[PDB]
């Protein structure tokens, strides 16, 4: 996994690759790592897959409860608190490494959140096995107050760096762009990797497989 | 390794307006075969089946406890459960055991009980779900199965071509794994019928 986020002039750009592994084998080629938290907050997930899924879902759900009650748009600090306090409670056993980004009444905010419950509030962050590759791109090229397309280029470049230099990362680049006026969930943003084409055909015709027993059970 | 103790393999595969799910039939304890007709694929509805490879005790417990939850859901709701909703149910059941999990990695294959749209997925042993448009595999010979599926599977296959493909992927995959095989069973799920076959297969 390579996940990443950037604060630009008018919002946040989040990014992620789409590979999921079981050991050193790819289980899923097109897995979605940018999670809905609220209409104005998203969260990229790296680490133990089930933990990132169930942790972001639970917090999203509790924020819906919260915002249902307040009648107000949720804040990024609130998502950050809820996540960090839960993760801290579990002492690192919930292996969720998160890039939390959104826009609220106080503007754009971006946090990284670690399994043990520490967080860092920063203008660019990266997480996952490909995070140093992605971070090298950010240190080389990030400027403050980038325009939207610059920020999107930079985040997709950072994810690509992870994709190609980390065996843990691969397949597509997904982006999410969040501003005061807009949410663009771009899945896929880029498909830099494609399977090669099959040269030979293995269309085995009916009867090729020998059968011992057959039962047809009709339905309504 | 806990997952190699009983061995076993399941896969599922998507076709045009149909799905297939398959499983080896061996029940063994390490090297020793005990039985050659062990159930690993269980009905969860007329057009919806779950296949469980892994530790045999938990293959059975997960199937049974999932059934408990499913039957209650259907009595309480108006209706037959949708494929996606069954996945979420299984996910939830396995993640409850996050810190002492069931040792099984299920695959689900079915048709949506209203649309009849094909569905397949798999889940890891703590409930991370994974939906695909082609195929899913699970068990001790997963790499073998991936090799066969990535090379044979094509889109929009009819019931007869889907049957041949899933059968060839299973038989050849399990023939390279010591602790899977002793037979293969295949279910083809269509709108109007279920076809269940056992294959001629190596018994060593």
């Amino acid at each position: 996994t390579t996940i990443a986020g950037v604060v630009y002039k008018d919002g946040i750009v989040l990014g992620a690759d789409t590979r999921a592994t079981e050991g050193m084998v790819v289980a899923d080629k097109n897995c979605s790592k940018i999670h809905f938290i609220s209409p104005n907050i998203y969260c990229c997930g790296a680490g133990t897959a089930a933990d990132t899924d169930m942790t972001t879902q639970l917090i999203s759900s509790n924020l819906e409860l919260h915002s249902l009650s307040t009648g107000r748009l949720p804040r990024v600090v609130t998502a950050n608190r809820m996540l960090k306090q839960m993760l801290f409670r579990y002492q690192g056993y919930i292996g969720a490494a998160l890039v939390l980004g959104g826009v609220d009444v106080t503007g754009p905010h971006l946090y990284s959140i670690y399994p043990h419950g520490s967080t860092d509030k920063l203008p660019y962050v990266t997480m996952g096995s490909g995070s140093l590759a992605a971070m090298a791109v950010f240190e080389d090229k990030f400027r403050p107050d980038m325009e939207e397309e610059e920020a999107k280029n930079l985040v997709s470049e950072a994810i690509a760096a992870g994709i190609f230099n980390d065996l843990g990362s691969g397949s597509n680049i997904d982006l999410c762009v969040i501003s005061k006026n807009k949410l663009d969930f771009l899945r896929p943003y880029t498909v830099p990797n494609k399977k090669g084409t099959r040269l030979g055909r293995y269309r085995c015709e009916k009867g090729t497989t020998a059968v011992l027993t057959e039962k047809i059970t009709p339905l309504e | 390794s806990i997952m190699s103790y009983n061995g076993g393999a399941v896969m599922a595969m998507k076709g045009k307006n149909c799905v297939a799910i398959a499983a080896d039939r061996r029940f063994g304890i390490q090297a020793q075969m005990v039985t050659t007709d062990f159930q690993k694929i269980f009905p969860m509805g007329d057009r919806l089946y779950i296949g469980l490879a892994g530790l045999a005790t938990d293959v059975q417990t997960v199937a049974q406890r999932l059934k408990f939850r499913l039957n209650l859901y259907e009595l309480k709701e108006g209706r037959q459960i949708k494929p996606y909703t069954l996945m979420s149910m299984v996910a939830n059941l396995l993640y409850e055991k996050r810190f002492g999990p069931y040792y099984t990695e299920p695959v689900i294959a079915g048709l949506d009980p209203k649309t009849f749209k094909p569905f397949i997925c798999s889940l890891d042993l703590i409930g991370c779900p994974m939906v695909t448009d082609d195929f899913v595999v699970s068990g001790t010979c997963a790499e073998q199965m991936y090799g066969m599926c990535e090379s044979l599977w094509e889109p929009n296959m009819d019931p007869d071509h889907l049957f041949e493909t899933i059968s060839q992927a299973m038989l050849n995959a399990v023939d390279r794994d010591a602790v899977s095989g002793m037979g293969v069973i295949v279910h083809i799920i269509e709108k109007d019928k279920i076809t269940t076959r056992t294959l001629k297969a190596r018994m060593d």
Partner: peptide, 4 residues
């Protein structure tokens, strides 16, 4: 256990 699947990872990202």
């Amino acid at each position: 256990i699947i990872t990202x």
